[PDB]
Amino acid sequence: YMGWWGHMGSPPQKGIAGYTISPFAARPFAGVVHAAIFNTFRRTKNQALFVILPVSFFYYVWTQASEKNEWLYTKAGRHELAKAL
Amino acid sequence: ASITSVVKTSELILKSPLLSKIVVPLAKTYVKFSGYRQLGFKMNDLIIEETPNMQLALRRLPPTESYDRVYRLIRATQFSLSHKLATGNDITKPEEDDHYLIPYILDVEAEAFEKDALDNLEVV
Amino acid sequence: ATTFYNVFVKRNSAFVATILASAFVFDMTFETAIDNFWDRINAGKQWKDIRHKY
Amino acid sequence: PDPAIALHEAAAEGPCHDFKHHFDECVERVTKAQEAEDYDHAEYKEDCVEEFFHLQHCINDNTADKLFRVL
Amino acid sequence: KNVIIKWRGKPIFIRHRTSEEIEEANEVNVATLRDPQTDDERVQKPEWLVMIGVCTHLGCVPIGEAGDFGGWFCPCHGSHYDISGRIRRGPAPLNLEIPEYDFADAETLVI
Amino acid sequence: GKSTYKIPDFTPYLKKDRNTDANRLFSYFMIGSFGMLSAAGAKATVQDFLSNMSASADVLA
Amino acid sequence: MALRKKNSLLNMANSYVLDSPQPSNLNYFWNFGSLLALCLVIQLATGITLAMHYTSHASLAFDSVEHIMRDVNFGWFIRYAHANTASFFFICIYAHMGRNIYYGSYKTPRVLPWSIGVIIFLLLIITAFMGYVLVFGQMSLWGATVICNLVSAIPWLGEDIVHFLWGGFSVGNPTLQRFFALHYLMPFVLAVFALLHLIALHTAGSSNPLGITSNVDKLSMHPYYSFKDLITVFAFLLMFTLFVFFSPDKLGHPDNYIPANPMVTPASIVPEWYLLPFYAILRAIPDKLGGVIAMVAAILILLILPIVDRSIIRGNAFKPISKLLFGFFICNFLLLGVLGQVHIEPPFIVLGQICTIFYFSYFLILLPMVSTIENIFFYIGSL
Amino acid sequence: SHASLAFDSVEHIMRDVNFGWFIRYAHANTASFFFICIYAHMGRNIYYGSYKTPR
Amino acid sequence: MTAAEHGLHPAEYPWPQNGMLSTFDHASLRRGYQVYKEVCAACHSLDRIAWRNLVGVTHTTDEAKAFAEELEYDDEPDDEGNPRKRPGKLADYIPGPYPNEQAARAANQGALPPDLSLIAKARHGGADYIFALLTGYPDEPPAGVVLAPGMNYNPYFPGGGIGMARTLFDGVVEYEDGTPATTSQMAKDVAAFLTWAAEPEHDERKKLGLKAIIVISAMLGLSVYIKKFKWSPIKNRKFIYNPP
Ligand code: HEC
Ligand code: HEM
Ligand code: HEM
Ligand SMILES: CCCCCCCCCCCCO[C@@H]1O[C@H](CO)[C@@H](O[C@H]2O[C@H](CO)[C@@H](O)[C@H](O)[C@H]2O)[C@H](O)[C@H]1O
Ligand SMILES: CCCCCCCCCCCCO[C@@H]1O[C@H](CO)[C@@H](O[C@H]2O[C@H](CO)[C@@H](O)[C@H](O)[C@H]2O)[C@H](O)[C@H]1O
Ligand code: FES
């Protein structure tokens, strides 16, 4: 499925012109401030739900579980503990 | 899963009025959130091609379609490495998101599935 | 500044020699400088600070 | 004399007063319960450890820094 | 009290069980016991519970006097042994093994 | 869009003084500093690490 | 023709580290491969050095580790480096497997590197478990006891096999000396498998975060990924430094600084943190043998991802529903880890079972369902 | 590997470990055979000019 | 578990050595050795510490040789093969109070006082736990606690009943540096000493870490410049597509 340089196994390419400049000709950090602020905000905003939803749910679950567990092993939780066992 | 299976199942859904009424709007939103159009891909550009069947289908694409596919992949790869999104004409509009490859792969698979069936035939 | 490039950077032999000599200098001076800094932030705490009593 | 003693007493009377009183009330109840007969033949014998821990935990939060500052 | 004698690196629990302890052990219906046995089958002398004090699940040594059946509790996976050293709750399949022990004298046993 | 002799806009990235010796020398100063710290860090790592093989404190006693 | 291409040996190096054609859009999650190679190298260097000072005999093992800590020049560093890098190795390996699951690196045509990878993962676990025993502190001994007794679950022969592993009737000197020899060896076996999964991968080349072909746009491995890998090497070394020099015992268990005592069983026996999710899965099943099978199945089930993912699209970058499901799977795996170290008490008993069910249902139910549905949504959605 | 125990551990292998005698002798003797074969292999290579180009 | 079964978790005290750039206070270490020597050494060994380890940490070479030479250690047998004792040398380990475990337990109503060389690493909490435990014997056990015989109530110890009695009282030690030997002062000093005993490399380790952090940070910064520099041709690449 992959070849090597010269016969990589691309479908034939034609009609794309690629341009680039030397690393010595370019400012490596051009527009870094804009990227670090606006680009990172954009990328983070678009992915935030996929992280927040599972994290918040499992943290809530753990919090409820750990709090119940703590309470069952108090004096107040004697009866509920006896039933749970 | 095979493109044939996906296409057949989709046709079952689009047939049933009830089913299409609830599925078509969901699928449109799914595709909007999928966000492949924001990198200038057409849906069919995403299909796994490292299978013998798909290699055959790609070889059967008309030259123009093939050259443009290569461009969309290169362009998208450059957006990916730059962490930028397409803007303006680079974004795939819904009207340009044509199933250019589906007919070719359906034909490749149809013959491969016929071949499997016929390899198992029993003279009655 | 051409001159600086020409002498220390243009030949890789020279550039590697310069890097290693600089690494030698850095290593020795950094050692000394951290020693002094560490002694100042931990003043009166270390054995060398109380040794004089004995 | 021991700086801890004074700091602990101050923290009990001050910021940890609620917990001090809880522990005190606990002690009173348990001693009273031990005073009564057929306590030894009871199922559940109440202790005051929990209230003690709440108090000590509180005292420690309000004292730790102060104590080590005067040593 | 429960003693721990090393024998082949494994700990041997020797408990000097009281009268009422023996009684508490003799109660549980044999029917409801992963490994169905009564104390009589386990000990050759009701006053000397001698066991290989290794948990039958995975091989921790149960912390004695702890449990929920107030005999031994394996802390590892929470399996509770009895005053007979029978399994009551938790993953452990069998009751705490009894080694080959004989009372040579009434005051000394060999393992 | 069509002519391939119209080089795309690179002005946001091009340095005006790109062909000066000052320009190259700067980038090599960064490369060389990195090589210098790598050399000093490697030497420190090697020296400290191999010292494990010299006589331990109990043997020196 | 250039030498690096002409000469057979140089050309093998060249094919992997220099001219190797890589996709030009690999993101930083493609850097864990090289960090795992760095961990492997650090573990070999520190491990071989520890072996020069450690004594495998149970009467001397723990003390030999103290001798390394106290007497050997930089012994403290070499020991802490070895112990902490074991933790970093697992962080990076989970990250790497996470990358592979999210981006569908397990799909055709990369099933073979994936499947060899699952074996590497098992070998890492075995290597790290044996290494932990070599300290012969309390957790060392009691961990070995518990984990080797799982083999007792094998029907009919189980007991006999355990005594065979131990070389005796309990974990003792024979076990410790054999674990030394195997712990030394296993990393070399692990390196061979690591190399095999790379050779297997080299036929298809790396996947990329878009999940499309990269045949259209390749970049040499060097200099581009060489220099990109340096960034994460220095990021890793910074994290390494903070643990090794400033908090060397944060990731450890204090009980391992008490010499092994076969009589006293420690208050809580937990495995090292990176084994905790599998430990929680084992606790979830009440049956001994069931628990062992479940624990093993939790690793071996990875082998069926190539089958149960029915998607026509490689990886999750473009699949919102799959991304949500993946998020829940990962958070559940971390919850399992946490439940591995709590006490076996309510309500964590039931919770552990629910998390275990969720773990397996991802592979067996949800991923097959979700991937089938998303196939349809892409097709209908783009009509 | 500890010098206080090394020699004795080899005796323990000879006397106590099942088939230890064989494993120890096999290891020690195969070290000799390894050299016989390596000299033979190098001898073959010298006599038959295996060292010449292109090898 | 009950809080009792866990033990009360000790406060976070501001130790001199807490802090990325902070060494131990060696004056405190020396004081703490004197507490170990006059109080703890009656029951607790410190077997992993040799006399030489004290030198240039707490004591000069001469002071430490003097401590070693006051003890008798097992020599090699004489010429008739009879056992002999010799005076201690710096290479000798600080000797324990008991010949074996059985003797230790017999002297402590069955409890075995642990070796303290590693106790600071072997307990959750470290210095804080040792300080809390030594100073945390209440005058009276909380009402309703049933202590096993020969146990003392201490909330910091898991289960609450510890076989070690309170041992630090104001003025059990007379410090040689004129510091007032209050219970808290002695506990702080001995806790610091035991922390040093557990991790004697502590001071050197943190200094090398400082060097590492500085150089590694600089290399990280430079590696980012270099990566960006080398990648700029790829990032800045532009395409013009004319469909054929
Ligand atoms: C005369 C007896 C005695 C003296 C004096 C003594 N200890 Fe102990 N110590 C013990 C015994 C016995 C235990 C075991 C307690 C147990 O396990 O129940 C112990 C336990 C400890 C423990 C560990 C508790 C644990 O978590 O297992 C520490 C730490 C400790 N001692 C430190 C000290 C320090 C510091 C001193 C004095 C400065 C000291 N001891 C003085 C008898 C003593
Ligand atoms: C010692 C442990 C390992 C090392 C050193 C290692 C190293 C690497 C390296 C260097 C690559 C190529 C670059 C990269 O994608 O990061 C890679 C790719 C891969 N590894 Fe690993 N790996 C290890 C363990 C594993 C494990 C445990 C798995 C799977 C369970 C795995 C599965 C893969 C797969 C599927 C790929 C191809 C991914 C792709 O590029 O799309 N590896 N590995
Ligand atoms: C993948 C490679 C390796 C991993 C993941 C690994 C893991 C571990 C672990 C987890 C420990 C317990 C550490 C502790 O808490 O002290 C350990 C100890 C040890 N390892 Fe390894 N190890 C690896 C490679 C090696 C190698 C190649 C050697 C060569 C002999 C080795 C020798 C040792 C020694 C001697 C110890 C005991 C001394 C000690 O605990 O530090 N290790 N290893
Ligand atoms: C091919 C490579 C060439 C051979 C490599 C040589 C291997 C070993 C060389 C030096 C090893 C011992 O050399 C010694 O190193 C240690 C650091 O490790 C230095 O020691 C210095 O730092 C350490 C901690 O970093 C302190 O404990 C010590 O007080 C201080 O003097 C000595 O100043 C140096 O004399
Ligand atoms: C990772 C550490 C560095 C050392 C290299 C790793 C060791 C593994 C190498 C042995 C495995 C065989 O590796 C195999 O070798 C040959 C040539 O070398 C490669 O062959 C490839 O490159 C050469 C030229 O570069 C071409 O003739 C060929 O068309 C192409 O497929 C294979 O793609 C690779 O799979
Ligand atoms: S080890 Fe005894 S309960 Fe699992």
Tab-separated table of C-alpha atoms in Angstrom, chain B residues 32-90:
chain	number	residue	atom	x	y	z
B	32	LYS	CA	-22.659	19.747	9.605
B	33	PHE	CA	-21.059	18.890	12.953
B	34	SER	CA	-18.738	16.326	11.336
B	35	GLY	CA	-16.995	19.313	9.818
B	36	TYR	CA	-15.203	17.615	6.978
B	37	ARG	CA	-16.544	20.317	4.677
B	38	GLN	CA	-14.475	22.838	6.655
B	39	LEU	CA	-11.317	21.247	5.273
B	40	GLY	CA	-12.633	21.270	1.751
B	41	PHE	CA	-13.277	17.550	1.578
B	42	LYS	CA	-16.197	15.893	-0.117
B	43	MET	CA	-17.763	13.068	1.880
B	44	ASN	CA	-16.395	10.431	-0.462
B	45	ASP	CA	-12.813	11.652	0.054
B	46	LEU	CA	-12.931	10.186	3.549
B	47	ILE	CA	-13.652	6.584	2.591
B	48	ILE	CA	-10.877	4.098	3.517
B	49	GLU	CA	-9.052	3.294	0.312
B	50	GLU	CA	-6.475	0.718	1.382
B	51	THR	CA	-8.589	-2.236	0.265
B	52	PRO	CA	-8.225	-4.024	-3.133
B	53	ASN	CA	-11.827	-3.103	-4.004
B	54	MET	CA	-11.321	0.578	-3.256
B	55	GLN	CA	-8.024	0.705	-5.081
B	56	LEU	CA	-9.847	-0.644	-8.120
B	57	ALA	CA	-12.629	1.905	-7.763
B	58	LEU	CA	-10.171	4.751	-7.537
B	59	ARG	CA	-8.388	3.546	-10.679
B	60	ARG	CA	-11.741	3.702	-12.470
B	61	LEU	CA	-12.312	7.392	-11.679
B	62	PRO	CA	-12.330	9.709	-14.754
B	63	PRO	CA	-8.969	11.545	-14.991
B	64	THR	CA	-10.442	14.932	-14.075
B	65	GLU	CA	-12.214	13.630	-10.962
B	66	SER	CA	-9.039	11.830	-10.000
B	67	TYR	CA	-6.804	14.874	-10.344
B	68	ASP	CA	-9.208	16.988	-8.355
B	69	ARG	CA	-9.417	14.381	-5.606
B	70	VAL	CA	-5.670	14.462	-5.256
B	71	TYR	CA	-5.822	18.222	-4.944
B	72	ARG	CA	-8.491	18.127	-2.250
B	73	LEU	CA	-6.437	15.631	-0.274
B	74	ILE	CA	-3.271	17.672	-0.566
B	75	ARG	CA	-5.084	20.857	0.280
B	76	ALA	CA	-6.755	19.251	3.307
B	77	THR	CA	-3.456	17.796	4.482
B	78	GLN	CA	-1.974	21.259	4.369
B	79	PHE	CA	-4.892	22.679	6.375
B	80	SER	CA	-4.446	19.912	8.883
B	81	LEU	CA	-0.761	20.525	9.430
B	82	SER	CA	-1.298	24.277	9.645
B	83	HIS	CA	-4.229	23.847	12.067
B	84	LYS	CA	-6.241	26.189	9.854
B	85	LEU	CA	-9.674	25.711	8.365
B	86	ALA	CA	-10.686	26.324	4.752
B	87	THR	CA	-12.129	29.741	3.977
B	88	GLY	CA	-14.286	31.036	1.135
B	89	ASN	CA	-14.170	28.829	-1.966
B	90	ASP	CA	-12.164	26.140	-0.215
